[PDB]
Design a binder for this molecule. Sequence first.
Ligand SMILES: *[C@@H]1O[C@H](CO)[C@@H](O[C@@H]2O[C@H](CO)[C@@H](O[C@@H]3O[C@H](CO[C@H]4O[C@H](CO)[C@@H](O)[C@H](O)[C@@H]4O[C@@H]4O[C@H](CO)[C@@H](O[C@@H]5O[C@H](CO)[C@H](O)[C@H](O)[C@H]5O)[C@H](O)[C@H]4NC(C)=O)[C@@H](O)[C@H](O[C@H]4O[C@H](CO)[C@@H](O)[C@H](O)[C@@H]4O)[C@@H]3O)[C@H](O)[C@H]2NC(C)=O)[C@H](O)[C@H]1NC(C)=O
Ligand SMILES: *[C@@H]1O[C@H](CO)[C@@H](O[C@@H]2O[C@H](CO)[C@@H](O[C@@H]3O[C@H](CO[C@H]4O[C@H](CO)[C@@H](O)[C@H](O)[C@@H]4O[C@@H]4O[C@H](CO)[C@@H](O[C@@H]5O[C@H](CO)[C@H](O)[C@H](O)[C@H]5O)[C@H](O)[C@H]4NC(C)=O)[C@@H](O)[C@H](O[C@H]4O[C@H](CO)[C@@H](O)[C@H](O)[C@@H]4O)[C@@H]3O)[C@H](O)[C@H]2NC(C)=O)[C@H](O)[C@H]1NC(C)=O
Ligand SMILES: CC(=O)N[C@H]1[C@@H]2OC[C@H]3O[C@H](O[C@@H]4[C@H](O)[C@H](O[C@@H]([C@@H]1O)[C@@H](CO)O2)O[C@H](CO[C@H]1O[C@H](CO)[C@@H](O)[C@H](O)[C@@H]1O[C@@H]1O[C@H](CO)[C@@H](O)[C@H](O)[C@H]1NC(C)=O)[C@H]4O)[C@@H](O[C@@H]1O[C@H](CO)[C@@H](O)[C@H](O)[C@H]1NC(C)=O)[C@@H](O)[C@@H]3O
Ligand SMILES: [Ca+2]
Ligand SMILES: [Ca+2]
Ligand SMILES: [Zn+2]
Ligand SMILES: [Zn+2]
Lengths: 237, 237
Amino acid sequence: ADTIVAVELDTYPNTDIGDPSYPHIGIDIKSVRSKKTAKWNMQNGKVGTAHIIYNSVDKRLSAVVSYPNADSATVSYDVDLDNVLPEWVRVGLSASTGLYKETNTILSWSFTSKLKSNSTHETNALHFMFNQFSKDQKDLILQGDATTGTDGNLELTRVSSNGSPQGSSVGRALFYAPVHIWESSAVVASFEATFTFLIKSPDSHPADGIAFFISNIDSSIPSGSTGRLLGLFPDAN
Amino acid sequence: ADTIVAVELDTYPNTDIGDPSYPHIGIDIKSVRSKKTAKWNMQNGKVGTAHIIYNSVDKRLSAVVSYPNADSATVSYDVDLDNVLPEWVRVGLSASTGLYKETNTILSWSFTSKLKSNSTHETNALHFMFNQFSKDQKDLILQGDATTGTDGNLELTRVSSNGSPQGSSVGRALFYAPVHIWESSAVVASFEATFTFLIKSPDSHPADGIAFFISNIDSSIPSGSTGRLLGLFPDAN
Ligand SMILES: *[C@@H]1O[C@H](CO)[C@@H](O[C@@H]2O[C@H](CO)[C@@H](O[C@@H]3O[C@H](CO[C@H]4O[C@H](CO)[C@@H](O)[C@H](O)[C@@H]4O[C@@H]4O[C@H](CO)[C@@H](O[C@@H]5O[C@H](CO)[C@H](O)[C@H](O)[C@H]5O)[C@H](O)[C@H]4NC(C)=O)[C@@H](O)[C@H](O[C@H]4O[C@H](CO)[C@@H](O)[C@H](O)[C@@H]4O)[C@@H]3O)[C@H](O)[C@H]2NC(C)=O)[C@H](O)[C@H]1NC(C)=O
Ligand SMILES: *[C@@H]1O[C@H](CO)[C@@H](O[C@@H]2O[C@H](CO)[C@@H](O[C@@H]3O[C@H](CO[C@H]4O[C@H](CO)[C@@H](O)[C@H](O)[C@@H]4O[C@@H]4O[C@H](CO)[C@@H](O[C@@H]5O[C@H](CO)[C@H](O)[C@H](O)[C@H]5O)[C@H](O)[C@H]4NC(C)=O)[C@@H](O)[C@H](O[C@H]4O[C@H](CO)[C@@H](O)[C@H](O)[C@@H]4O)[C@@H]3O)[C@H](O)[C@H]2NC(C)=O)[C@H](O)[C@H]1NC(C)=O
Ligand SMILES: CC(=O)N[C@H]1[C@@H]2OC[C@H]3O[C@H](O[C@@H]4[C@H](O)[C@H](O[C@@H]([C@@H]1O)[C@@H](CO)O2)O[C@H](CO[C@H]1O[C@H](CO)[C@@H](O)[C@H](O)[C@@H]1O[C@@H]1O[C@H](CO)[C@@H](O)[C@H](O)[C@H]1NC(C)=O)[C@H]4O)[C@@H](O[C@@H]1O[C@H](CO)[C@@H](O)[C@H](O)[C@H]1NC(C)=O)[C@@H](O)[C@@H]3O
Ligand SMILES: [Ca+2]
Ligand SMILES: [Ca+2]
Ligand SMILES: [Zn+2]
Ligand SMILES: [Zn+2]
């Protein structure tokens, strides 16, 4: 199995495998059984503002989500990125659904690592600002059944049947280039994200949520994940 | 051949194929016959500072080289990056030598693309700061006989014979990810580079220089370049 750490912007309450009763933001270490959860609003088709950092000066993997005219859901978990996440990685997005529909329109995405040559000595970056998901974007090795383009969009579904996006489809959005992390050159790489999304109400109880992972340099769609596995865990444990 | 535009920091005056009678800095549009030239001091092992930009509001393609306590060589050339270099690229470094030895140590490298989604609408980046070329850097697809590591160094020769780097050595340093250019969405992708080299005096009339190219997404070392072909040209025209 692939070593993986996700941040769940879940929309489906998975009571059986361990999610709380409401649509929530959370955080995952190698299991769908999250470490912390928090209250998330889950409005209809509106837009976007999510934000995930990790400063090893403070070792908090902090995360907030805001609609404009909404709150900020802090779901920060104490995790040491020393021993949990590989020496070189492959970041990306992940959405999925199964037996229920939701729209998972991503419209922009970013990153910024800053990793410690000699702590002051000019930390290495990988900053990008993808406001322009093209039709033929090629620094993504997008897996599953994700699509892109036709507008500035990264559709992590099988879509365009009036955008009621054809339940039990999964597509991930793995960015091309790796990042050195594990510790080894210690682990102050304050990796940021901004994750402007759009979850349209399908008039069908919108459910399964979008994620944000940092996986191994290899991955796949693990063992079939058309549903509760959130696109990236092979098993529900 | 493969379409490629480089900045030759040539250190042998290739007297028969277009370069001047002095070791210069040039700029190459598909031809080792250059488009500008500029006088270079050729100091011994001292560090580095070279810097290459291209906006498309002013359409000049520029470069300078100054050692600290030395002067700069503005070898800027006006060329239309619209029709000369493909949409998706693979940036990086190229050095070579043949029958003459020199040091081609690179210690740091950076970049910043900014390509015009809708000019103010939050253009896309790929910025990095590689001050710390490690032993197992894996967003580099370094071709030829390039080495790295053992220290923070990128060694584009075959090295460690007391830094007498084993002539007829060629090494390339192709970065991993692609960038949109050609024009199409227009071409103001103001790509920067920092090119901090080290050319140690090997006490051996040091001569062939490092380049900085921008190529197609596919490449190799073309038809042998152990010498004046400068690592990226198949042909001397
Ligand atoms: C039949 O016709 C053909 C052609 O018409 C002739 O065949 C050969 O053609 C070759 C064409 O490529 C050509 O080779 C190139 O020569 C140039 C010029 O350099 C040398 O040219 C002659 C070759 O003998 C001579 O005039 C010189 O020997 C000259 O070489 C210089 O020699 C110095 C002392 O020997 C030498 O000092 C050396 O220093 C180093 C360290 O610094 C050593 O360790 C040692 O201590 C010393 O020997 C000089 O450095 C040396 N060079 C110079 C510039 O003065 C040459 O530019 C080219 O080499 C280039 O190619 C590589 C490829 O990447 C590139 O990196 C450089 O640009 C490099 O300069 C070729 O060598 C020959 O002229 C020719 N061969 C001969 C023997 O003449 C035939 O001659 C014709 N037959 C008949 C019967 O006429
Ligand atoms: C083995 O021993 C033999 C001795 O017998 C020697 O080998 C060869 O022998 C051949 C016959 O004996 C003979 O071959 C000659 O080749 C040259 C090569 O042409 C270029 O090089 C010249 C060097 O002096 C230049 O002066 C020329 O101008 C010529 O350049 C041409 O013009 C353009 C650039 O100037 C270029 O256009 C480019 O094309 C690219 C393509 O993509 C770009 O888009 C853009 O359009 C341009 O940049 C042309 O392509 C280019 N032509 C080429 C590369 O072929 C040839 O010129 C020559 O013809 C004349 O040569 C002299 C004048 O130069 C004249 O006196 C003759 O009578 C003849 O008319 C021959 O075909 C050579 O003797 C030799 N070849 C050598 C040495 O290179 C060698 O000594 C030994 N070794 C080998 C490996 O053979
Ligand atoms: C076939 C059967 O007997 N199913 C049982 C179920 O057995 C396994 C199934 O698990 C999922 O089934 C869903 C629920 O778990 C639920 O309860 C039963 C179900 O009958 C459970 C345990 O009791 O065991 O049934 C819902 C259907 O919704 C009705 O039940 C609700 C109770 O949770 C309750 O709100 C209502 O009775 C509701 O009826 C509708 O709602 C209102 C509210 O009262 C009524 O007034 C309406 O008239 C009525 N109709 C409508 C149209 O509103 C069932 O969905 C299921 O597993 C899901 O798989 C999906 C794929 O990812 C995903 O959604 C999620 O992972 C799973 N959901 C879970 C576990 O809850 C199936 O695999 C199994 O059939
Ligand atoms: Ca789930
Ligand atoms: Ca030369
Ligand atoms: Zn969840
Ligand atoms: Zn030159």
